[PDB]
């Protein structure tokens, strides 16, 4: 139905040599994927709804001039977004970075009722509003 001289190719993609990443950056660097935990200073939620990948932090020395934050690894302030973790891990393997996986932690739904603020015998009765 889509005849274009199709060929079964079982082994996974090795686009590594195509990407141009240097050997030690494609080998030594370890990237982890995760859902970023929300800033506890905020109650907003729509920042833990994506799968972001980031790389291990490297040396950060202070230059002699003003004590700036000169670094050497270019892939330090590089974070990639992904809808589902499967896409992220596929990208990681096909690129060739050693990857680490953390499962999407989500808040457990707790039973909440205002009638618990008052009680006849339960300890849950509040003492101030």
């Amino acid at each position: 139905t889509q005849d274009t001289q199709l060929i079964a190719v079982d082994e996974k993609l090795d686009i590594t040599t195509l990407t141009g990443v240097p050997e030690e950056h494609i080998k030594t660097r370890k990237v982890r994927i995760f859902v970023p935990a929300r800033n506890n200073m905020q109650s907003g939620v729509n920042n833990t709804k994506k799968w972001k990948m980031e790389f291990d932090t490297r040396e950060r020395w202070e230059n002699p001039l003003m004590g700036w934050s000169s670094t050497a690894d270019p892939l330090s302030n590089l974070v990639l977004t992904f809808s589902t973790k499967e896409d992220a891990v596929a990208f990681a393997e096909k690129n060739g970075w050693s990857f680490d996986v953390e499962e999407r932690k989500v808040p457990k739904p707790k039973s909440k009722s205002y009638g618990a603020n008052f009680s006849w015998n339960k300890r849950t009765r509040v003492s101030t509003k």
């Binding site: 040396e59 020395w61 202070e62 230059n63 002699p64 001039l65 000169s70 050497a72």
Partner: protein, 342 residues
């Protein structure tokens, strides 16, 4: 180590290597190159100068911003030396001329200046000092160059017990005044070798080799006190060496027999020019003086560098003198000269 001296980075321009050099007299030949290796790794060199900073702009590219601080220094001033080396951990002495200036006598630039350098440095508290002096330096050599260099070495070693004296042999590399010397010898008629120059052996070194050796001696922990000697891998007799460089330049070779006193007369004639004489009497008393072998002196490969043969890197140095007839020719057209080995 001082809290601002811990090594940091990855050897690039902004890497903090932990070296605070001084490279006295870095505005010339190897001074250009050593700063490179000091600037490339990342180190706040304090290169002083006496000429116009114009002849120092070529040091600006070879260093990230905030490095290679330039300071004015005067030879006959202990205060200038103190200002330049007040805040340093290594002081590198490369100050040395080849022609006798009518104002600066040969010995001052080779013992009095190095002696003052060593004294003020040791008073300041610099960890390591590396003084440079010709390998052929002998107390009673016929050329006053080597004699003065020998007394300077002994004076510096007396003043600075742990100074790392370097004895380089004749050095080549771009602006060399040794390869270009014999290369331009055609300009002054046929090449006037003393007694046709069949009796002088030479052991040249590539400048990058000696500069890298200086850098390692800085990084080497045991380099204090010792005295290194910088020799090339192979050694040529003078006649075949001139043959090789002329063939590389493809300029016709017309060797000219000459008595020693006749070349002395020619050197005295050339010493009267008022700027950068092409040759001197002392230069004549140097060229025919073959470089001795000093096996008991720790050589160059012990530091870690590998000596680069002259044949590999003669193309770049002799390339300019090639005319357009063979300006497009490669190295392999010239077979390496018949080295007289051990």
């Amino acid at each position: 180590l001082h809290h601002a001296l811990i090594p940091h980075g990855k050897g690039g321009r902004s890497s903090v290597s932990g070296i605070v050099a001084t490279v006295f007299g870095a505005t010339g030949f190897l001074g250009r190159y050593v700063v490179n290796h000091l600037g490339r790794m990342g180190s706040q060199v304090i290169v002083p100068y006496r000429c116009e900073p114009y002849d120092t702009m070529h040091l600006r590219p070879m260093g990230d911003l905030g490095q290679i601080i330039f300071m004015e220094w005067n030879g006959k001033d202990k205060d200038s030396i103190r200002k330049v080396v007040e805040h340093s951990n290594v002081v590198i002495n490369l100050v040395g001329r080849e022609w006798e200036t009518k104002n600066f006598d040969f010995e001052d630039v080779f013992v009095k200046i190095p002696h003052a350098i060593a004294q003020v440095s040791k008073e300041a508290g610099v960890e390591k000092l590396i003084h440079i002096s010709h390998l052929n330096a002998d107390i009673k050599s016929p050329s006053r160059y080597l004699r003065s260099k020998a007394v300077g070495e002994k004076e510096v070693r007396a003043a600075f017990p742990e100074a790392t004296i370097i004895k380089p042999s004749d050095i080549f590399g771009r602006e060399d005044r040794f390869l270009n010397y014999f290369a331009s010898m055609r300009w002054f008629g046929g090449v006037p070798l003393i007694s046709l120059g069949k009796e002088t052996v030479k052991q040249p070194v590539y400048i990058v080799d000696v500069s890298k050796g200086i850098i390692n001696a800085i990084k080497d922990p045991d380099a204090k006190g010792k005295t290194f000697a910088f020799v090339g891998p192979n050694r040529y007799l003078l006649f075949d060496l001139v043959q090789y460089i002329f063939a590389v330049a493809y300029r016709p070779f017309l060797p000219y027999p000459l008595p020693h006193f006749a070349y002395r007369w020619v050197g005295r004639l050339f010493e009267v020019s008022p700027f950068e004489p092409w040759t001197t009497r002392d230069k004549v008393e140097r060229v025919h003086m073959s470089d001795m072998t000093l096996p008991h002196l720790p050589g160059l490969e012990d530091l870690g560098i590998q000596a680069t043969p002259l044949e590999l890197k003669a193309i770049e140095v002799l390339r300019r003198h090639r005319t357009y007839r063979w300006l497009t020719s490669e190295m392999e057209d010239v077979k390496p000269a018949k080295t007289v080995n051990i």
